[PDB]
Design a protein around this ligand. Structure first.
Ligand SMILES: *C/C=C(C)/C=C/C=C(C)/C=C/C1=C(C)CCCC1(C)C
Length: 227
């Protein structure tokens, strides 16, 4: 096939794999129970991303959805990735500030809605309705971000500055990166079709890698993960 976006898919696969292995190696050397916890969660994130990037690289996770008078290429494998990686990242943040079970449940649920409606919208055949689903998915993301900024930050204040400071950074990277996804979707292949798929794939790999390996590197190198 040789689609123009394959190089970005290859680069995404490469970076997710390397990040996974490094986390795995670093994770199985640590003896601390809590640290192990964070390591297992944070290693799984890029591990899942790797498998999906690899699949997409190999020609799977791609479907032609008709709308706008065109046969649009929609990479659905992405949602198969995010469905499990986004809530896991959320869990990492939750465990960090000792969030309550109710909060976590609500965050993971909002996250499920976000990815769920997101895919439904990415698959919808009525052009205008694609944006209705997109709209609901974004509303869910804003809820998650609101909670992370207003809820979590507040509880991270019962933690040690080292932990509060680590969370702030992770929270910040998350707010900035996550905020970008809906915009990429809106102007890319799933939306307005303004930004071409190859470029679109590039933007997604940068955000994905930053949000997983970037996030992991920051979290795992901190002393805040220790019991
Ligand atoms: C490793 C992957 C990460 C951190 C992915 C984050 C993804 C989002 C915040 C995605 C958000 C979306 C919307 C707000 C609406 C349209 C569809 C999505 C799923 C692209």
């Amino acid at each position: 096939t040789g689609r123009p976006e394959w190089i970005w898919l290859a680069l995404g696969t490469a970076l997710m794999g390397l990040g996974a292995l490094y986390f795995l190696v670093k994770g199985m050397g640590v003896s601390d129970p809590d640290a192990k916890k964070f390591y297992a969660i944070t290693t799984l994130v890029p591990a899942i991303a790797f498998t999906m990037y690899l699949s997409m690289l190999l020609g799977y996770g791609l479907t032609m959805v008709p709308f706008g008078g065109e046969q649009n290429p929609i990479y659905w494998a992405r949602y198969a990735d995010w469905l499990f990686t986004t809530p896991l990242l959320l869990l990492d943040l939750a465990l960090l500030v000792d969030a309550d079970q109710g909060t976590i449940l609500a965050l993971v649920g909002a996250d499920g809605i976000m990815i769920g409606t997101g895919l439904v919208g990415a698959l919808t055949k009525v052009y205008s309705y694609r944006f209705v689903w997109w709209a609901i998915s974004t509303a869910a993301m804003l809820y998650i971000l609101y909670v992370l900024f207003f809820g979590f930050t507040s509880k991270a204040e019962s933690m040690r500055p080292e932990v509060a400071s680590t969370f702030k950074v992770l929270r910040n990277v998350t707010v900035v990166l996550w905020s970008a996804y809906p915009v990429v979707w809106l102007i890319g292949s799933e939306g307005a079709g303004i930004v071409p798929l190859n470029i679109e794939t590039l933007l997604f790999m940068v955000l994905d890698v930053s949000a997983k390996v970037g996030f992991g590197l920051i979290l795992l190198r901190s002393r805040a993960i220790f019991g």
